Write a protein that binds this ligand. Sequence first.
Ligand SMILES: C[C@@H]1N[C@H](CNC(=O)c2cccc3c2C(=O)c2ccccc2-3)[C@@H](O)[C@H](O)[C@@H]1O
Ligand SMILES: N[C@@H](Cc1ccc(O)cc1)C(=O)O
Length: 438
Amino acid sequence: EIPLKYGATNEGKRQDPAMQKFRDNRLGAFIHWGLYAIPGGEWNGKVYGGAAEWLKSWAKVPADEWLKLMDQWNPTKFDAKKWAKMAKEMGTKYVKITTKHHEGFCLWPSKYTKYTVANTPYKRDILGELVKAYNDEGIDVHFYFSVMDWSNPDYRYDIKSKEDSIAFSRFLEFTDNQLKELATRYPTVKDFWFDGTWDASVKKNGWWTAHAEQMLKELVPGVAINSRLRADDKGKRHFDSNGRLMGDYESGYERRLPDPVKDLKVTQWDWEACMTIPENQWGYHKDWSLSYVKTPIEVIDRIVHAVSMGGNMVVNFGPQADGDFRPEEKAMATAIGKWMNRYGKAVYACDYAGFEKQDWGYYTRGKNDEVYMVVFNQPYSERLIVKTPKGITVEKATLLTTGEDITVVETTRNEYNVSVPKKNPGEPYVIQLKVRAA
Ligand SMILES: C[C@@H]1N[C@H](CNC(=O)c2cccc3c2C(=O)c2ccccc2-3)[C@@H](O)[C@H](O)[C@@H]1O
Ligand SMILES: N[C@@H](Cc1ccc(O)cc1)C(=O)O
């Protein structure tokens, strides 16, 4: 056991009502919106294939010239109530919003920098408007915050000199200032999700990551903080030197997921995955034809996969520069919402079931020890194999959307065939199981 001043603060999972709400929510939306939405991946007549929110980097745009995009920031179609309605209809229980991305442009009118929505033609507090509108629909709001900031020259990727140390200290104070500000202006914030924390400068300043977490928890009672922020005394990131999760939940499953057989370790801690609809675009990119674009069922599969392994999933949207959503995103939100309305009982407030993974889909476990079978792959055999842990029996099976009774047949020791339904539900569907221990 290695002694640490700034290692993990939680032992096991938090179970206060704030964390249980964070967990029960399960399905989130991500909003990446900033100046990058104006060029939409194109600069000086070249369309760049990389992620649009990184266009400053791909097109090698100097800060002062990138930040002039502010003179074109005028999202006249923006209506926060309509954004919140689109979220509510999708079934999203929370939204994670880029308060500021790597570019450093702020969606709220910060007093600590001029690179904010206040100094645009639109002028309005986009963030405040969203927080209110989402909250009025019953949707929790989480703040994405990039520590790395391309707009502040005091930022340093590493500390290799007295000059570096002096500058980066000014940068941490500035960061501190923005964080206190966000927490005090928007006290309904439920989470801060730090990103752009990978540089050696943050690793050397692990003390600060611990301070930021503690500062925010005092200012916002119950607030969640992600593991990405954190490094310990030894410079060890995410999980401390004693193997313990730092922050409140693990956050490294970005555009990927743990394996349902090999990675059951993730069930021991809270965690949240995120994903894009195209292969790798968070902010608005004008041309989605340049990579593969996931269909709604492919996205739902990923959502259910996360919940089946005790994790949340956050699906990204990159709104247009005019304040509206592209057609592909509207279609996606609508399709997810249609599905969650019918089958969300197997997602919201659900968790890892402890059953061996089967080919037809995923198990999830409800608050009242219900076990849901979520079927993505329909067997031609008309039989869904269920292997139970030792000492566990299956008693009933019911179609979730029709109440229709479902045959259960014992096939061997600890194994059942659960019949499918008489009519193919025709999309991924859900069977609830009653189970009994010894
Ligand atoms: C949500 C997205 N986060 C990006 C930065 N993070 C990464 O690209 C990333 C991708 C996969 C895994 C990780 C990361 C990442 O930083 C990170 C830190 C610690 C553990 C795992 C990861 C940003 O660069 C993107 O613009 C977008 O905001
Ligand atoms: N573990 C529960 C039974 C159970 C097991 C797995 C489940 O997915 C649900 C319920 C008990 O001790 O009674």
